[PDB]
Amino acid sequence: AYKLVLIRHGESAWNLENRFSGWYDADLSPAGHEEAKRGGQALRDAGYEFDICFTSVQKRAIRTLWTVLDAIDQMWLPVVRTWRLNERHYGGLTGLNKAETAAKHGEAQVKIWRRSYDVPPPPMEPDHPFYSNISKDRRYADLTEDQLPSCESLKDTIARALPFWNEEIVPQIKEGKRVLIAAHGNSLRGIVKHLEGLSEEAIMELNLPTGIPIVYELDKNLKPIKPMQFLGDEETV
Amino acid sequence: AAYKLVLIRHGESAWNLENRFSGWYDADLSPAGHEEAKRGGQALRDAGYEFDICFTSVQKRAIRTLWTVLDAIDQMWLPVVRTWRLNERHYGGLTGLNKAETAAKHGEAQVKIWRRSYDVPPPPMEPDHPFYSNISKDRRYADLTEDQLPSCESLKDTIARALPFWNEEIVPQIKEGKRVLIAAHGNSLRGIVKHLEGLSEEAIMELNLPTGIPIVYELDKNLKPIKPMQFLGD
Ligand SMILES: O=C1c2ccccc2C(=O)c2c1cc(S(=O)(=O)O)c(O)c2O
Ligand SMILES: O=C1c2ccccc2C(=O)c2c1cc(S(=O)(=O)O)c(O)c2O
Ligand SMILES: [Cl-]
């Protein structure tokens, strides 16, 4: 009868969520911050309590979590950060808008990437404006060459998220700790795919809403007993 | 030096403006106290400081100070550890009372005694106290044993429960080469400074750490300061 809550961060600065923000450490926009506050207020109104929180090492997710903990008066909770919950690494496309992407690689190839589970985008090369910014960022200094991506397929992203789910999060849930996870579209996709046993095609069609608490009820095998539910006023739901 | 340690004491709280004893009551920062934390964070940013792990209490005036600093230095991704052992001194029955109410009920002499005493506690927070359930029954302390959860603390009590965390969880991290930031409260930080500098009870009671200001220690491999604490800023 466990309860798990997920929350996907909202809008980031400079329209970066429509520019393959990926591993670039974009902050929330004021709008994204307000979204997180609304999500937190929904959790507060519903009287939710947590015992432990997981998030990525990207400040838009961390700030989403902080906003939520502030709203629900549980700033004292233990918080665990991991690169394994980071957004998908969009490689050389990182920072580009739709037009720039199609101009550079063509519509055909974009259609293929968009629709593919196991094809990565091109690698982020040294001439990319974010190359040293991300690859030499001190928060990833303990990662091995194989762990630090230059690019990720969705398959890759899920593959590195799920070890953390199994090794760090599952044991807490089975101890009865009430878990909050604040993360990103694709890392949360990995979790949802695992929970609901979805196909590659289905998970690629699933777009989790932003700034809205997503509630799971899990049985003793960590299988959902019902569809995911969204928290908030009747309309927003 | 072999190691570098940074301490920061949170600034003004909402109850400081009311002249009320907070102790374990979870008062938030005032707007002013929050600004103090931003200025401290900007001083750490200007000085180019990097950390590897952060410790704070389970009280939001300290936690928010920490968040404010991490935001300022662009290190929100750092591991953060919270512990009740770094909480402010527990002021027992005085909790919630302002200066006037305290002197009215207990007299100037008794407040004078409590003020300057290292080892005399204030009266206990009893079950009929207005904040008794608010503090003593708060679920964040549910894992504390009976003897661990205080009804009141002398400064000696406070130091006594802070230093185990220092010895068992912070010291090992420093000797592992981790650059530590501690964001906490006047009296718990007093505990750390007292252990570090080998100060007397008298000296530690005369020590008032500035608020919102990074306090920098340079330590040898045995964690002995090699010079006086330094304050960071303009
Ligand atoms: O172009 C891409 C793309 C390119 C390279 C790697 C991954 C993706 C990708 O994942 C993607 C894309 C477009 C859309 S969109 O036009 O339908 O909004 C998506 O939804 C979407 O997920
Ligand atoms: O009233 C107190 C007090 C009351 C009860 C227990 C402890 C203290 C105490 O420790 C204290 C006090 C006042 C001052 S102050 O008025 O000089 O700012 C202090 O500096 C200070 O340390
Ligand atoms: Cl945190």
Are A183 and A158 within 8 A, CB to CB?
A: no
Q: Which residues of B touch A73 (CB under 8 A)?
A: 60
In the set B34, B36, B88, B129, the catalytic residue is B88
Burial zone of B201 (CB within 10 Å; 0-12 exposed, 13-18 middle, 19+ buried): middle
- Residue A125 has a CB neighbour count (10 Å cut-off) of 11
Known binding residue A22? Answer is yes
Give me the DSSP letters along B37-72: HHHHHHHHHHTT---SEEEE-SSHHHHHHHHHHHHH
If one counts every other C-beta atom within 10 angstroms of the C-beta of residue B105, the result is 13
Gap between the Cα atoms of B64 and B112, Å rounded? 32
CB contact under 8 A, B63 and A75: yes
Taking CB atoms and an 8 Å cutoff, what residues of chain B touch A141?
A: none
Q: Whose CA is nearest to atom 5 of ligand 2?
A: B114
How many residues are present in chain A? 237
Could you give the count of Cα atoms lying within 13 Å of B83 in the half-sphere of its Cβ?
17
**Of B34, B70, B13, B67, the residue nearest B186 (C-alpha):** B13
Q: Which long-range contacts does B97-104 make (Cβ < 8 Å, 24+ apart)? A: B97/B20, B97/B21, B98/B18, B98/B19, B98/B20, B98/B21, B99/B19, B100/B19, B102/B21
Contact B140, B58 (CB under 8 A): yes
Which ligand gives the minimal distance to the CA of A99? 1
The kind and range of the H/E element at A132 are helix A131-135
CA–centroid distance, residue A113 to ligand 1 (Å): 7
Ion ligand 3 contact residues with beta carbon within 5 A = A 79; B 80
Range of the domain at B62: 1-234
Mutate to test the interface with A, among B77, B81, B85, B179 (most CBs of A within 10 A): B77
Q: How many whole angstroms separate alpha carbon B139 and alpha carbon B132?
A: 13
Report the candidate in B6, B189, B173 with the shortest Cα–Cα distance to residue B89.
Answer: B189
Q: Label residue A216 exposed, middle or buried (CB < 10 Å: 0-12, 13-18, 19+).
A: buried
Ligand nearest to C-alpha B112: 2
CA angle B93/B95/B96 to nearest 5° reads 125
Nearest CA to ligand 2 atom 9: B115
Which residues in chain B have their CB less than 8 angstroms from residue A58's CB? 77
Report the DSSP beta bridge partners of residue B184. Answer: B9
Would you tell me how many other CB atoms lie within 10 Å of the CB of residue B81? 16
Q: Which ligand is nearest to the CA of A64?
A: 3
Rounded to 5 degrees, φ, ψ at A182 are -110, 110
* Contacts for A15 with CB less than 8 Å, ≥ 6 apart: A97
Residue pointed to by tokens 């003897």: B147
Q: CA of B221: how far to CAs of A10, A25, A231, in Å?
A: 45, 35, 52
When CB atoms are compared, the residue of A76, A78, A81 closest to B77 is A81
Contact call for residues A38 and A232 (beta carbons, < 8 A) = yes
- For residue A149, give the nearest of A127, A124, A116 by alpha carbon: A124
Which own/partner contact pairs does B133-137 have at CB distance under 8 Å and 24+ positions apart?
Answer: B134/B25, B135/B24, B135/B25, B135/B95
* Distance from C-alpha of A194 to C-alpha of A158, rounded to nearest angstrom: 9
* Number of neighbouring beta carbons within 10 Å of residue A212: 20
Q: Does B77 touch chain A (CB under 8 A)?
A: yes
Q: Locate tokens 């950390």: which residue? A: B51
Question: Which residue of chain B comes nearest to A75, CA vs CA?
Answer: B60
The overall longest dimension of chain B from CA atoms, in Å, is 52
Residues of chain A in contact with residue B77, where contact means CB-CB under 8 angstroms, are 57-59, 62, 81, 139
How many structural domains are present in chain B?
Answer: 1
Helix (H) or strand (E) holding A39: helix A30-45
Yes or no, beta carbons of A138 and B80 under 8 Å apart: no
Angle between the N-to-C axes of helices A98-105 and A107-115, in degrees from 0 to 180, rounded to the nearest 10: 110
- Contacts by A226-230, CB closer than 8 A, 24 or more apart: A228/A192
Give the Cα separation of A215 and A6 in Å (integer): 7
Q: CA angle A218-A220-A222, nearest 5°?
A: 45
Is A167 considered catalytic here? no
Q: Which two tokens stand for residue A89?
A: 């690494």
Tell me what percent of chain B is helix, strand and coil, each rounded to the nearest 5: 45, 15, 45
Question: CA nearest B131: which of B103, B104, B92?
Answer: B92
Q: Give the CATH number for residue A200.
A: 3.40.50.1240
Which residue in this structure is represented by tokens 């952060």?
A: B54
Could you give the C-alpha distances from A93 to A108, A127, A158, B121, in angstroms and in order? 15, 12, 19, 63
Other beta carbons within 10 Å of B186? 16
Which residue has the CA at smallest separation from atom 3 of ligand 1? A114
Cβ of residue A13 closer than 8 Å to a chain B Cβ: no
* Per-position b or e across A154-163, b if 16+ CB within 10 A of its CB: bebbbebbbe
As a whole number of angstroms, the distance between CA A100 and CA A3 comes to 42
CB B190 within 8 A of CB B163: no
Stretch (H or E) spanning A179: strand A179-183
User: Ligand 1 atom 16: the closest Cα is on which residue?
Assistant: A114
| Alpha-carbon separation of residue B224 from A102, B51, B79, B143, B213 (angstroms) | 60, 20, 25, 33, 21
User: What size, in residues, is chain B?
Assistant: 234
